[PDB]
Swiss-Prot record, chain A:
It is found in: Secreted. Expressed by the liver and secreted in plasma. Residues 4-66, 67-124 form the Sushi domain. Head-to-tail homodimer and heterodimer with CFHR2 or CFHR5. (Microbial infection) Interacts with C.albicans GPD2; the interaction is direct and leads to the degradation of C3. This is Complement factor H-related protein 1. Involved in complement regulation. The dimerized forms have avidity for tissue-bound complement fragments and efficiently compete with the physiological complement inhibitor CFH. Can associate with lipoproteins and may play a role in lipid metabolism. Glycans are attached at residue 108. The chain holds residues 19 to 143 of 330 of the full protein. It is linked to Hemolytic uremic syndrome, atypical, 1: An atypical form of hemolytic uremic syndrome. It is a complex genetic disease characterized by microangiopathic hemolytic anemia, thrombocytopenia, renal failure and absence of episodes of enterocolitis and diarrhea. In contrast to typical hemolytic uremic syndrome, atypical forms have a poorer prognosis, with higher death rates and frequent progression to end-stage renal disease. N-glycosylated. Two forms are observed; one with a single side chain and the other with two. Disulfide bonds join 5-54, 37-65, 69-111, 96-122.
Curated annotation (Swiss-Prot), chain B:
Head-to-tail homodimer and heterodimer with CFHR2 or CFHR5. Glycans are attached at residue 104. The gene is CFHR1. Involved in complement regulation. The dimerized forms have avidity for tissue-bound complement fragments and efficiently compete with the physiological complement inhibitor CFH. Can associate with lipoproteins and may play a role in lipid metabolism. Expressed by the liver and secreted in plasma. The lineage of its organism: Eukaryota, Metazoa, Chordata, Craniata, Vertebrata. It is linked to Hemolytic uremic syndrome, atypical, 1: An atypical form of hemolytic uremic syndrome. It is a complex genetic disease characterized by microangiopathic hemolytic anemia, thrombocytopenia, renal failure and absence of episodes of enterocolitis and diarrhea. In contrast to typical hemolytic uremic syndrome, atypical forms have a poorer prognosis, with higher death rates and frequent progression to end-stage renal disease. It is found in: Secreted. This is Complement factor H-related protein 1. It comes from Homo sapiens. Residues 3-62, 63-119 form the Sushi domain. Disulfide bonds join 4-50, 33-61, 65-107, 92-118. N-glycosylated. Two forms are observed; one with a single side chain and the other with two. Transmembrane segments: none annotated. The chain holds residues 20 to 141 of 330 of the full protein.
Length: 125, 119
């Protein structure tokens, strides 16, 4: 427990009025900040601005910017996830057409921080 | 019409933009909006189809406007995200104004019509 929170470090995040605060500042309990996520990232509630409050236990809710993953279709393949936007942590299945394959030793392709774990592409090799 | 013109989306980004003239009917594109802008359904990627009546749904990227509070003032819109076309009222304390005795501000394409600040 503490009387303060450290300034929030949010990966892929932007604070409202950022340029007005210092990164080593001690933020008192009860203080309220708002964060947004960079293009291609989203907050847990999908709200453009998310309120975060300094508590004795740290920032509440925990600030987080999750990667959005998408593909419109799969050339020489199919997926129920075609044209659907997925969140970081989601797994998608892709079935390739005859003579094509999704070369990876995993049954599912994951949406990770950097994007798709494996490209959503069926190859002729 | 047998085709649609290539879509010009202000503050928009097409999926596989750096890959693509007249577009035939039935063709499907996906668009996203730049940071601070949003599609009408709020979806990150929006499917648009070329029809005999043009692009369906009509592609659009609307500005999002926000302020957490008003220093030396008040607003029912404090901590609320507003969409392009919305109007917001701000009441300033004792001897303060919003550039200047304007009282009401609106969310426009460039952002807030007047900064939400009581000076």
């Amino acid at each position: 427990e503490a009387t303060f929170c450290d300034f929030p470090k949010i990966n892929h995040g932007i604070l409202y009025d950022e340029e007005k605060y210092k990164p080593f500042s001690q933020v008192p309990t009860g203080e309220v900040f708002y964060y947004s996520c960079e293009y291609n990232f989203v907050s847990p509630s999908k709200s453009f601005w998310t309120r975060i409050t300094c508590t004795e236990e740290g920032w509440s809710p925990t600030p987080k910017c999750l990667r959005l993953c998408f593909f419109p279709f799969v050339e020489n393949g199919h997926s129920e996830s075609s044209g659907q936007t997925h969140l970081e942590g989601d797994t998608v299945q892709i079935i390739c057409n005859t003579g094509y394959r999704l070369q990876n030793n995993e049954n599912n392709i994951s949406c990770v921080e950097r994007g798709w774990s494996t490209p959503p592409k069926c190859r002729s090799t």
